[PDB]
Design an enzyme around this catalytic site. Sequence first.
Site, PDB file in Angstrom:
ATOM      1  N   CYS A 198      -6.074  -6.221  -2.099  1.00  0.00           N
ATOM      2  CA  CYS A 198      -5.406  -5.196  -2.878  1.00  0.00           C
ATOM      3  C   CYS A 198      -4.382  -4.549  -1.955  1.00  0.00           C
ATOM      4  O   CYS A 198      -4.312  -4.886  -0.772  1.00  0.00           O
ATOM      5  CB  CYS A 198      -6.410  -4.168  -3.413  1.00  0.00           C
ATOM      6  SG  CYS A 198      -7.178  -3.094  -2.161  1.00  0.00           S
TER       7      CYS A 198
HETATM    8  O1  VO4 Z   1      -7.854  -0.021  -3.658  1.00  0.00           O
HETATM    9  V1  VO4 Z   1      -7.846   1.879  -3.902  1.00  0.00           V
HETATM   10  O2  VO4 Z   1      -6.286   2.550  -4.833  1.00  0.00           O
HETATM   11  O3  VO4 Z   1      -9.373   2.474  -4.911  1.00  0.00           O
HETATM   12  O4  VO4 Z   1      -7.885   2.437  -2.077  1.00  0.00           O
END
Ligand code: VO4
Length: 149
Positions: free
Chosen positions: A93
């Site tokens: 992510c």
């Molecule tokens: O992948 V997060 O926006 O919950 O740090």
Amino acid sequence: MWPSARFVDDNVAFSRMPTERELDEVAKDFDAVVVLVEEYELPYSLEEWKKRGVEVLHSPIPDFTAPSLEQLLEILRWIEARVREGKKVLIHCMGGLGRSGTVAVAWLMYSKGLPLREALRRVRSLRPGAVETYEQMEVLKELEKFLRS
Ligand code: VO4
């Protein structure tokens, strides 16, 4: 090895988002990527992975939210398939490690049968901060209930 990745087992790792400069680097080590970042926050096209022969699962999870249990099961089943093909898989992510860390904890529960408490401890030992929100913890609890049943 691409030292930004942390492995939770022999085949599955999680990391920050590789930049366009690092794509050949992680393609050398990984044959499949689970891309949790939203389309509009990408700084290159995911066709960059395809032109390197890397399989892509694009299953975005919005910033600071948790995946649904169905979404998580879909991701886990896909990781499973790639691992069975002999591939190494990188979950990532962009920004923190809340969402990728959540999928990493779920993978340990799903594939190793670890209870949530131990799976969480493990991933947080790898990256302090993994699993950032109450909602992320709660979908992991829902997963544990699903698996126990
Ligand atoms: O992948 V997060 O926006 O919950 O740090």
